[PDB]
Amino acid sequence: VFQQYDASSVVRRELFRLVARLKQIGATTVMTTERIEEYGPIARYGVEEFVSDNVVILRNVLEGERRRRTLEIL
Amino acid sequence: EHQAIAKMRTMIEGFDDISHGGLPIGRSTLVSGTSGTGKTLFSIQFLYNGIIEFDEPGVFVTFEETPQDIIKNARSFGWDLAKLVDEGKLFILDASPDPEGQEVVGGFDLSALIERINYAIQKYRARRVSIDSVTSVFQQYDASSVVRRELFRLVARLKQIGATTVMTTERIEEYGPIARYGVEEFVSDNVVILRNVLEGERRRRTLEILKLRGTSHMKGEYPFTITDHGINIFPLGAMRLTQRSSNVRVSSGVVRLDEMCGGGFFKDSIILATGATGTGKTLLVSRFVENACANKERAILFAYEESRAQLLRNAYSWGMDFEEMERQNLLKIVCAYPESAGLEDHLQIIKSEINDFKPARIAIDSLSALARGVSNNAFRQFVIGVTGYAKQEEITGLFTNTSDQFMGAHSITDSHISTITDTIILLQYVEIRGEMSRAINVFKMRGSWHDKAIREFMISDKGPDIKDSFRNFERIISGSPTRITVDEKSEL
Amino acid sequence: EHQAIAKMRTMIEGFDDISHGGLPIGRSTLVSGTSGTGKTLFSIQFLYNGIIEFDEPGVFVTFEETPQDIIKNARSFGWDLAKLVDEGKLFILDASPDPEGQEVVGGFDLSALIERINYAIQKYRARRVSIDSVTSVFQQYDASSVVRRELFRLVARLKQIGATTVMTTERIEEYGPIARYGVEEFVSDNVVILRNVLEGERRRRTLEILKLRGTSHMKGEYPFTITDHGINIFPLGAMRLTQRSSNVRVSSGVVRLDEMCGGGFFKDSIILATGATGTGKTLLVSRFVENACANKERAILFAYEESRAQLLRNAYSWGMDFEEMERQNLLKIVCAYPESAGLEDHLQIIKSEINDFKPARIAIDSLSALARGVSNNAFRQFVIGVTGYAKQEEITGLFTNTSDQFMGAHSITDSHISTITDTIILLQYVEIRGEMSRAINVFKMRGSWHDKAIREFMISDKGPDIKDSFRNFERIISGSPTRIT
Ligand SMILES: Nc1ncnc2c1ncn2[C@@H]1O[C@H](COP(=O)(O)OP(=O)(O)OP(=O)(O)O)[C@@H](O)[C@H]1O
Ligand SMILES: Nc1ncnc2c1ncn2[C@@H]1O[C@H](COP(=O)(O)OP(=O)(O)OP(=O)(O)O)[C@@H](O)[C@H]1O
Ligand SMILES: Nc1ncnc2c1ncn2[C@@H]1O[C@H](COP(=O)(O)OP(=O)(O)OP(=O)(O)O)[C@@H](O)[C@H]1O
Ligand SMILES: Nc1ncnc2c1ncn2[C@@H]1O[C@H](COP(=O)(O)OP(=O)(O)OP(=O)(O)O)[C@@H](O)[C@H]1O
Ligand SMILES: [Mg+2]
Numbered sequence A: 001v002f003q004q005y006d007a008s009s010v011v012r013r014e015l016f017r018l019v020a021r022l023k024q025i026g027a028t029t030v031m032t033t034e035r036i037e038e039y040g041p042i043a044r045y046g047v048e049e050f051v052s053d054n055v056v057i058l059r060n061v062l063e064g065e066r067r068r069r070t071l072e073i074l
Numbered sequence B: 001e002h003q004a005i006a007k008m009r010t011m012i013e014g015f016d017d018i019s020h021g022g023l024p025i026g027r028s029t030l031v032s033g034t035s036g037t038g039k040t041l042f043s044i045q046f047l048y049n050g051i052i053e054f055d056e057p058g059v060f061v062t063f064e065e066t067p068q069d070i071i072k073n074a075r076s077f078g079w080d081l082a083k084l085v086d087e088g089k090l091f092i093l094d095a096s097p098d099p100e101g102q103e104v105v106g107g108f109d110l111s112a113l114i115e116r117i118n119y120a121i122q123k124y125r126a127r128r129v130s131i132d133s134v135t136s137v138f139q140q141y142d143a144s145s146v147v148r149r150e151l152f153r154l155v156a157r158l159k160q161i162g163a164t165t166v167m168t169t170e171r172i173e174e175y176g177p178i179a180r181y182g183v184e185e186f187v188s189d190n191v192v193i194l195r196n197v198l199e200g201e202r203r204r205r206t207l208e209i210l211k212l213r214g215t216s217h218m219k220g221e222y223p224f225t226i227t228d229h230g231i232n233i234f235p236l237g238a239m240r241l242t243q244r245s246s247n248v249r250v251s252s253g254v255v256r257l258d259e260m261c262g263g264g265f266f267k268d269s270i271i272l273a274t275g276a277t278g279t280g281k282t283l284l285v286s287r288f289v290e291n292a293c294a295n296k297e298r299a300i301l302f303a304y305e306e307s308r309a310q311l312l313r314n315a316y317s318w319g320m321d322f323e324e325m326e327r328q329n330l331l332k333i334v335c336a337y338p339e340s341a342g343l344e345d346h347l348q349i350i351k352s353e354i355n356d357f358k359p360a361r362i363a364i365d366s367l368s369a370l371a372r373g374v375s376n377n378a379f380r381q382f383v384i385g386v387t388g389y390a391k392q393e394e395i396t397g398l399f400t401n402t403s404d405q406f407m408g409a410h411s412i413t414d415s416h417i418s419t420i421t422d423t424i425i426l427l428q429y430v431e432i433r434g435e436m437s438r439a440i441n442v443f444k445m446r447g448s449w450h451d452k453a454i455r456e457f458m459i460s461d462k463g464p465d466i467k468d469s470f471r472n473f474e475r476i477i478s479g480s481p482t483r484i485t486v487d488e489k490s491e492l
Numbered sequence C: 001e002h003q004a005i006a007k008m009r010t011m012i013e014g015f016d017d018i019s020h021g022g023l024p025i026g027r028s029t030l031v032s033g034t035s036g037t038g039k040t041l042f043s044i045q046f047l048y049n050g051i052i053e054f055d056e057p058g059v060f061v062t063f064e065e066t067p068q069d070i071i072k073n074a075r076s077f078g079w080d081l082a083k084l085v086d087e088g089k090l091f092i093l094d095a096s097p098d099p100e101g102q103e104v105v106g107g108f109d110l111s112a113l114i115e116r117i118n119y120a121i122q123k124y125r126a127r128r129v130s131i132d133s134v135t136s137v138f139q140q141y142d143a144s145s146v147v148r149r150e151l152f153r154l155v156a157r158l159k160q161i162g163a164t165t166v167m168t169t170e171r172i173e174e175y176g177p178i179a180r181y182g183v184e185e186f187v188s189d190n191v192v193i194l195r196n197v198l199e200g201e202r203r204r205r206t207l208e209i210l211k212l213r214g215t216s217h218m219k220g221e222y223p224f225t226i227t228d229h230g231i232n233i234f235p236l237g238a239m240r241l242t243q244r245s246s247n248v249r250v251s252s253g254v255v256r257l258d259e260m261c262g263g264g265f266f267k268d269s270i271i272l273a274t275g276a277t278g279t280g281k282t283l284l285v286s287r288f289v290e291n292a293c294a295n296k297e298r299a300i301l302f303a304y305e306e307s308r309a310q311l312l313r314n315a316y317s318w319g320m321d322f323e324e325m326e327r328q329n330l331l332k333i334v335c336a337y338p339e340s341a342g343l344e345d346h347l348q349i350i351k352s353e354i355n356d357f358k359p360a361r362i363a364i365d366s367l368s369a370l371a372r373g374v375s376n377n378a379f380r381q382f383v384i385g386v387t388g389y390a391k392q393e394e395i396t397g398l399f400t401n402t403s404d405q406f407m408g409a410h411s412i413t414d415s416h417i418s419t420i421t422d423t424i425i426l427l428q429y430v431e432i433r434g435e436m437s438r439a440i441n442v443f444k445m446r447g448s449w450h451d452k453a454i455r456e457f458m459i460s461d462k463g464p465d466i467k468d469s470f471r472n473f474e475r476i477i478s479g480s481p482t483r484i485t
């Protein structure tokens, strides 16, 4: 969604707003994010990591031409 | 003052040792790390122990989490902040943004916030302050220089107020810049880094005090664990070589062994049993643990290779009833796969259980197994830890090691622990006439005389029977001997 | 002038050797490092030593820390800067900014400051100047080229004024660019890099003189330690091969051993005892430490494997009363886990205590335990250090090594220290008739004759009893001989 034309701080605020309203509503939510590096930043803007209560990382590691998927609760 | 800076104790286990007394009073300490490293917890524990142990009030400033959530999450450690809030010992000042909306909130910000803080500090007579993620504040639209100044402003004002502060920051790289802007590291007088390093697919949390302007402190990383009691750090390098040492003896559970050891093991001593798979290490352990019950003493057997059932089946087949030892409350078995945790975790589980059960003896069936995966240095560190704890605690410890190669093993340990051990019991296979027999040797014993024989031995339902040496053999040690003697008896 | 660039001593231990005399006079040296490397301490010690050893006044310009703080911090090292400021020998120029706030007072920037530093210099007749974190100043909003110019301007004015200056910078990568803007490197005449390298959860502080325009200096990184006395550097490559060498003998504490060594160890010598675990290295050490007390000489036993109490239990069980040696103030036991320090630190503790106690003998029980973790090269460097020190100080040193494999060991040392050593005593297990007997062998002795036999020996309460050689056996070195009839 902010992959429209945004910078880190704008993302942190918007996310926080959403998560926050959701918590008020009382909803249990799962929010999905993209990453480009298997071991780099947690998510794109290097800001979602700290704005959420829980973080789960799905990895699909290469290593020798085979692919291994791993799940981590960070 | 004409004195070098004084510290405030955090009471956070392990930390005051690493920091040589605590955090510098009146200054602020930057604590940064990646997501989920324990920043927020450190800061809460710092205020909490402040209140519960010195009756020093605390002000907790929050920029993102909600006071209700900060109180709610602390229940995870058995802490009632809501109570302390109530008794005016703790005051959470909410600095988070409202889920609705206003623009241009950078200016008045700092300043207002600062007197909000000053106001709260003055109001509750606070001694401790924690500001949770200052990072998130300029994460509004800023560049390094603007950050550097704002930080500086804040630290400064707080210094003036005279508050001892813990400030929290986020990082995105485990070994990348200290904190997001690459500027916070320098503005702060003290910097602490919490790491949650991956590796294998395991994670190891470490704490490092990078710098404390004015005083000394331990250097490097130290492994820690978050538990129901919060942050727990083990300064494995701060453990001193001052363990008590007696001349008291205790039994191995095998009389013949006891003789070989010049009258049983020393009470104060680390014993290591080694040898190829199937030798008889587990048998020796069982026997050593039983011996402490038959003498109505408590013993823990931490097993990393067999189930609690299997241990019981095999034990009973060697005589010894583990069932009874259990009921009688003299013997306690543990069991867990090496992989179900990190060495740091294991070490703590061990220590923890030693405290609830106060054993007189302890056995870890297979260090060799705990070495599975882990690096050698991480491992050696682990051994010194369990070993040294045992030693300073007057607990007799028997550790087991399976050698990677049966017969021909050229070193006592593959991980080179032999030096970290007082007595060494060696088990080996000896090929004698197309058959695999066993041999047992007391390779070494620090304070006694012990037997230098490589005695053969058998295993039955009665347990271990130690027979005689292989006198008429050369290359016993090699596992594949050779018999000698070329003169039976003839005439004059 | 017409001659060889003159240097001002820093008096910072070890630095003047590395820099071949000190900082070049009248020019400025850049000293950069990451957070907590000791930039600030260097720069203060340079001024403080100036004042206290040469009565050269100093000016310390601070852009971030507060003067009260600078003063407070120095108390860590037992230095009263407030006194020096009062006596007019030191002047701390506060250039930090207003916690309060304004943004239009420094529109006269570099220019103005340069005037106050010149005013201060003249006023206090300053010879040394330390500018702390110049970096932080343009960390206002600048680009590489702007920094290059300002720095140059400053360096230059100070050069004109004639002052010898220490300028401090910050870096973010231990081995990346030299300072923040990749520009200060080239504008200073001298560059000094302070590193706090991580590597294995341990930290190691290293100092490097990267360049000194116009003179020579030692190249590369040298380890150092920040202590109560401030920066301490050991230029391990600056130690010369000029140790004194006598023919005098001393006892090993074991007469028969003395015989085998052709009358004892040499006073000036480094003796190595190697052997599988449990062979008896520690018994020899005990015995060698005890012999120095019976002769009323001081000996230090640095122990890295056993507790002070255990050492005592086992020693007493071998005769010898370590208790008395202690009281009599003839013997001193240390004890520490290799893990409780870096080799650099360890080395220094050792030196340190040798200095406070002036021993005649010294025994390090298990060099092999100090090699735990560390790199071979880092470790060899350590050995040369302790060895060399004992050698030039006329102290007789007995060091221990446990070989990784009992029986069949194919080298004296796994770390290959043999050769840096004068005498090598060797202990090994020998399988004789289903039993594990021991054997001792004086493997090599540099200026003497020594016995070539591999004698069997026993350990009792009385101690080590060296018996006879296994004449009627082959492959004794294998550990598994072959009694030939
Ligand atoms: N009772 C507990 N037992 C063991 N682990 C705990 C327990 N409670 C919390 N944890 C662990 O501690 C973590 C909490 O981290 P914490 O809230 O301290 O702050 P953070 O990681 O520093 O910062 P943030 O999450 O605000 O980005 C959890 O991720 C979890 O792994
Ligand atoms: N009732 C019994 N009677 C005769 N021999 C037995 C009996 N029980 C076990 N054994 C023998 O003892 C061996 C078991 O080894 P033990 O349990 O002592 O541990 P270990 O050799 O130290 O370690 P690991 O089993 O993991 O290799 C078997 O290989 C077997 O020969
Ligand atoms: N008495 C002392 N004993 C041992 N170490 C000390 C003592 N006092 C201070 N230290 C150490 O020295 C360090 C001080 O470094 P210093 O203040 O010199 O400047 P810096 O690291 O160069 O720069 P910055 O201003 O970014 O912190 C501390 O991080 C600490 O490790
Ligand atoms: N009172 C004693 N009587 C007979 N032998 C003893 C006595 N005390 C120790 N020993 C023997 O001496 C050995 C002790 O070795 P020692 O303490 O000298 O150190 P080490 O072999 O050099 O090093 P490490 O113990 O670290 O392996 C034991 O293996 C044992 O056989
Ligand atoms: Mg087993």
Ligand SMILES: [Mg+2]
Residues within 6 Å of the ligand: C281, C282, C283, C305
């Ligand atoms: Mg020893």
